[PDB]
From a paper:
Meiosis protein [name] is an essential component of the synaptonemal complex (SC), which mediates homologous chromosome synapsis. Within the SC, [name] forms an intertwined complex with SYCE2 that undergoes fibrous assembly, driven by [name]’s C-terminal tip. [name] undergoes conformational change upon C-terminal tip mutations, indicating that the sequence responsible for driving SYCE2-[name] assembly within the SC also controls the oligomeric state and conformation of isolated [name].
Similar to the dimer interface of the ΔCtip tetramer, the FFV structure contains a central ‘hinge’ characterised by reciprocal salt bridges between R78 and D82 amino-acids. Accordingly, the FFV structure matches the symmetry-related dimer (r.m.s. deviation = 1.11 Å) but not the unique chain dimer (r.m.s. deviation = 4.25 Å) of the ΔCtip structure, hence our designation of the former as the dimer interface. FFV’s Ctip sequences play no role in stabilising the dimeric coiled-coil, and simply emanate from either end of the molecule, where they mediate interactions within the crystal lattice. Ctip sequences arrange molecules in an end-on ‘dimer-of-dimers’ fashion by forming inter-molecular anti-parallel coiled-coils. Given that [name] FFV is a stable tetramer in solution, its dimeric crystal structure likely represents an alternative conformation induced by crystallisation. The most fundamental unit is formed by the dimer interface, which involves anti-parallel coiled-coil interactions surrounding a central R78-D82 salt bridge hinge, and is the sole interface within the FFV dimer crystal structure.
Author numbering:
A (entry chain A), D (entry chain A): 50 to 123
B (entry chain B), C (entry chain B): 46 to 123
Amino acid sequence: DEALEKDLNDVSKEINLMLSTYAKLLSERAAVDASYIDEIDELFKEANAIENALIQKREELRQRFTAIANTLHR
Amino acid sequence: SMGKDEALEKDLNDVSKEINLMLSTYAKLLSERAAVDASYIDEIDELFKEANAIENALIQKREELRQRFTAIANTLHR
Amino acid sequence: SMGKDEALEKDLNDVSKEINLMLSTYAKLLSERAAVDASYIDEIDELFKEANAIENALIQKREELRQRFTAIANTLHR
Amino acid sequence: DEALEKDLNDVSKEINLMLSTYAKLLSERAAVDASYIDEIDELFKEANAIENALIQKREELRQRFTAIANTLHR
Ligand SMILES: [Ca+2]
Ligand SMILES: [Ca+2]
Ligand SMILES: [Ca+2]
Ligand SMILES: [Ca+2]
Ligand SMILES: [Ca+2]
Ligand SMILES: [Ca+2]
Ligand SMILES: [Ca+2]
Ligand SMILES: [Ca+2]
Ligand SMILES: [Ca+2]
Ligand SMILES: [Ca+2]
Ligand SMILES: [Ca+2]
Ligand SMILES: [Ca+2]
Ligand SMILES: [Ca+2]
Ligand SMILES: [Ca+2]
């Protein structure tokens, strides 16, 4: 019911809106990826600190067990 | 009482659960991105096809006006 | 070695963190619902207004056809 | 460029699609709410079991401390 010229201008506006919206969404992905990488890195560092402490504690237990055994069996 | 080794094992499991949840949340975000990307392509394709059809009809409309004014000019001379 | 009381305190904190995350995820889902509800109202309103305008124009179109056929009938008798 | 009758039928289809889609979304909220309530309930029960065990352990520590004190100060 509107002229073809008017309808062409309406659809062009729809295109520009979708393009501008998607461009924005795409431009934001890098910072989101960077945030996940940063936070996963923090968690892996936390896990590695716990794991390392567990390794140390297990070696101390090995040494305590060996010492008690040697004292008891001579 | 209990061993610190046991407590450290438990704390390592706690952080492993957090890592697994973060990795799975990120994997989900990537799936949502893929579906968004494909939907954009479908939808922008529909819009560009509609725009080109309107554009082609508008070109035809201007030529129809040219033809109709030419026919009037010929009618005036009759 | 360490006390089981300390280990239990730590485990209680671990579950409290999970509760807090679940409560906040649910609070987020409710916010998304509210925005969805309001968007539905905006969008269905636009559609019903468009439908009523088309409907009213169609009623007018049928009456215009009635008027145009009546005028033809009067022209035929001239 | 289409007749008003055709356009009325197109918009009616759009309405029915939006209504049917929203009705579905609304009908699904109860099961989602129920799932959150169920899972939060499981977590609170887990937390209460830990808390209760901590209360018991603290009372045992109170009794061990009192007994050692009495033995040492007579
Ligand atoms: Ca038109
Ligand atoms: Ca238009
Ligand atoms: Ca390590
Ligand atoms: Ca813990
Ligand atoms: Ca398609
Ligand atoms: Ca499509
Ligand atoms: Ca073209
Ligand atoms: Ca824990
Ligand atoms: Ca509105
Ligand atoms: Ca609106
Ligand atoms: Ca009406
Ligand atoms: Ca029309
Ligand atoms: Ca139509
Ligand atoms: Ca309790």
